[PDB]
């Protein structure tokens, strides 16, 4: 059988999380998952499912589960869904239209914001094209916004492509950090490896 307990703690309670442009992914497999316990393991401000009902997860078996995690601002959580547009969905992390999975988020102001600004979390602000679904672009090429070629140097109209969120504790919640975990539930014509307790 499968007998290991799925290692969600590894992803949900990582003490550091990725910048959204550099989002992390962990494949989960060969384990037993209890999604109700997971849901009542903390207080998620968002727990939203596509292609499946949250109430059924413990009855299903998947070929694999993937967990993508990162930090964004509160107001951008709405962008982590199929069919959305905006700087995050367009340039940093894009879900496919046929996505099947859950999007889970919670407010991480106590952890991720620093008095006079945490500048360590970054997002991609400029890009020549929109991401394809599940594209991961970590490049740092200088973006040419004007007529004048950049030759790889920050300048007038030549922009470093990543901007720091700078989370501060007294920000409005829109502009407070949220941790996000996206769980994709994959079904292929192959033996199931991730099941519920029954």
């Amino acid at each position, epitope marked *: 059988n499968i007998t290991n307990l799925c290692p969600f703690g590894e992803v949900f309670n990582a003490t550091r999380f990725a910048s959204v442009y*550099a989002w992390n*992914r962990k*494949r989960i497999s060969n384990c037993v998952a209890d999604y109700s316990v997971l849901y009542n393991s903390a207080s998620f401000s968002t727990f939203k499912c596509y292609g499946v009902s949250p109430t059924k997860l413990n009855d299903l078996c998947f*070929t*694999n589960v*993937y967990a993508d995690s990162f930090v964004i601002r509160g107001d951008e959580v709405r962008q982590i869904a199929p069919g959305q547009t905006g700087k995050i969905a367009d340039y940093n992390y894009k879900l*496919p239209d046929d996505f099947t999975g859950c999007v889970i988020a919670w407010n991480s102001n106590n952890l991720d914001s620093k008095v006079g600004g945490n500048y360590n979390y970054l997002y991609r602000l400029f890009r020549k094209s929109n*991401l*394809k*679904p*599940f*594209e*991961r*672009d*970590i*490049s*740092t*090429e200088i973006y040419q916004a004007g007529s004048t070629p950049c030759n790889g140097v920050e300048g007038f109209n030549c922009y470093f492509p990543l901007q720091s969120y700078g989370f501060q504790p007294t920000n409005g919640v829109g502009y407070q950090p949220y941790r996000v975990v996206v769980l*994709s539930f*994959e079904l*292929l*014509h*192959a033996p199931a490896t991730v099941c519920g307790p029954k």
Partner: nanobody
Amino acid sequence: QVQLVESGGGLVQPGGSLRLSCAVFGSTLDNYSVGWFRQLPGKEREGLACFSRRYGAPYYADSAKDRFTISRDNAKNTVDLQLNGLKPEDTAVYYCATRSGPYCTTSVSDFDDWGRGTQVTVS
């Protein structure tokens, strides 16, 4: 049944660019993802980049920042890895690998079919 062929390896000079291609024969499905790995002398295999065929989506590992491009040539039907500024430290065995479905990763143990690997040696 699935067999993977790497093309483009061998002896290269520092400074030029390298184009490796991965050709996939006998796949039972079209919905799969293609990873590129290298193995430096005396180290573990490490993932560089992965391409999701369904989503047309490149996925770069932290180690591939700013030198490697992964893409698909729909004419040759290959998944290609381009390395731009060859240094002697680029000398290694490069492999391509596949996994089923559209989810890329650059982790060795997530792929089940491998090519034989191709020696790249930088002068």
